[PDB]
UniProtKB/Swiss-Prot annotation, chains A, B:
GO terms for cellular component: chloroplast; chloroplast stroma
Organism in which the protein naturally occurs: Arabidopsis thaliana (Mouse-ear cress)
Name the UniProt record assigns to this protein: 2-C-methyl-D-erythritol 4-phosphate cytidylyltransferase, chloroplastic
Upper classification of the organism: Eukaryota, Viridiplantae, Streptophyta, Embryophyta, Tracheophyta
Function: Enzyme of the plastid non-mevalonate pathway for isoprenoid biosynthesis that catalyzes the formation of 4-diphosphocytidyl-2-C-methyl-D-erythritol from CTP and 2-C-methyl-D-erythritol 4-phosphate (MEP). Is essential for chloroplast development and required for pigments and gibberellins biosynthesis.
Span covered, complete protein: 77 to 300 of 302
Tissues showing expression: Expressed in leaves, stems and flowers, but not in roots.
Amino acid sequence: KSVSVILLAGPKQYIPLLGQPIALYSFFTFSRMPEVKEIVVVCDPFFRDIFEEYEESIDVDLRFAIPGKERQDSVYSGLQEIDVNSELVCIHDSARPLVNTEDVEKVLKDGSAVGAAVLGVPAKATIKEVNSDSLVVKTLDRKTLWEMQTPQVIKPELLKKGFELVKSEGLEVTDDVSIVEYLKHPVYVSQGSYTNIKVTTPDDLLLAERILSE
Amino acid sequence: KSVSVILLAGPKQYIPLLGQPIALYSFFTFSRMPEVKEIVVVCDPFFRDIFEEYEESIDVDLRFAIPGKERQDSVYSGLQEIDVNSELVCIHDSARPLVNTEDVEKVLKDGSAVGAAVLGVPAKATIKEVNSDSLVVKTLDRKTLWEMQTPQVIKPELLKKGFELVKSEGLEVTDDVSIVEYLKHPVYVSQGSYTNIKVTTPDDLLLAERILSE
Ligand SMILES: [K+]
Ligand SMILES: [K+]
Ligand SMILES: [K+]
Ligand SMILES: [K+]
Ligand SMILES: [K+]
Ligand SMILES: [K+]
Ligand SMILES: [K+]
Ligand SMILES: [K+]
Ligand SMILES: [K+]
Ligand SMILES: [K+]
Ligand SMILES: [K+]
Ligand SMILES: [K+]
Ligand SMILES: [K+]
Ligand SMILES: [K+]
Ligand SMILES: [K+]
Ligand SMILES: [K+]
Ligand SMILES: [K+]
Ligand SMILES: [K+]
Ligand SMILES: [K+]
Ligand SMILES: [K+]
Ligand SMILES: [K+]
Ligand SMILES: [K+]
Ligand SMILES: [K+]
Ligand SMILES: [K+]
Ligand SMILES: [K+]
Ligand SMILES: [K+]
Ligand SMILES: [K+]
Ligand SMILES: [K+]
């Protein structure tokens, strides 16, 4: 019971899906996993009650952190709240409500082994690198390209070192494992499921209801 | 009236969308464009009547070609049917029923100017190159990666030269502009719309009905 989750929830994350705010879906998935010791929800204080409500229903410590200006500052804020002895930090965008227990288990395993891991899926589209003149530079090898999801799972000492680089050099990162890439430490891509979609538009909500109804 | 369309339609392309087989949607879009002189539909002969039916409703020459084993052989088969003097070949996957007239006009313009062009959209996901050990090699620069759609628009002399390379060297290509890339001739990526989705699953059909109902 060694994993700390940072659940990034700081309104599109509170849009109802089957009547319940999207952020609660992944919250419950992590709360039922035996490896998870605590969930640090990063949200505006106004929304804390959405989660506290369920606190006596769940077998994790529930803690909060205040969001920052950019996703990386929200991650940093959650990281100050995790247990001093957690073995792994599992960072998740609450706009991904449909992550599967099996896929979380897999990226936790791979993060334990490598130190950093992220859920990904092979890209289904043909992807080309395009220069600033709108010309194709190259076609990227289909067998080689992965679309990233969350969770991103990183050992805390590694993440803390990475934030020391980020804060001391003004890095801008849009994900968590980019910090570890900077460090030249390996990042493992764990194969997930294409159903772990991000839900931000009402088109995405309709797809999420379809997936849930399958 | 200078453009020849090769419409690749050779059953998931005949699944109904609002009651009409998917392949007819883009067929009609191209038939109404003044630049299009002819549409060569590549389909099994059994399906020809789906399109012929509308022949006196449309201001293009309607022709057919027989599909081959792989997409590139189907393209080659359509290419043998185009007008000896067309200025541009516009190749489209009939599983993309929602392409917009405005986006077709744009990629035709860019194909006229460059010799090869393809509709694309910036990739919305974070994409990483991953080696065979499942490790991230690099994170690809978000500002630089495009997802390809169809049409792909190529001048016929260029395409014919490219097929001479393909047939004389056993190339396997999953798109049309890869042939021109091989030739070291420029390929322009014209910015399209994220609504030009490929419809193969019933999830995609539901999204396509939503888009059409917007
Ligand atoms: K979940
Ligand atoms: K637990
Ligand atoms: K504790
Ligand atoms: K607290
Ligand atoms: K904090
Ligand atoms: K603290
Ligand atoms: K999801
Ligand atoms: K969620
Ligand atoms: K999943
Ligand atoms: K596990
Ligand atoms: K291992
Ligand atoms: K910043
Ligand atoms: K997944
Ligand atoms: K929409
Ligand atoms: K269309
Ligand atoms: K026409
Ligand atoms: K003619
Ligand atoms: K004919
Ligand atoms: K032919
Ligand atoms: K012919
Ligand atoms: K489409
Ligand atoms: K179509
Ligand atoms: K379009
Ligand atoms: K045009
Ligand atoms: K020009
Ligand atoms: K082949
Ligand atoms: K488009
Ligand atoms: K499905």
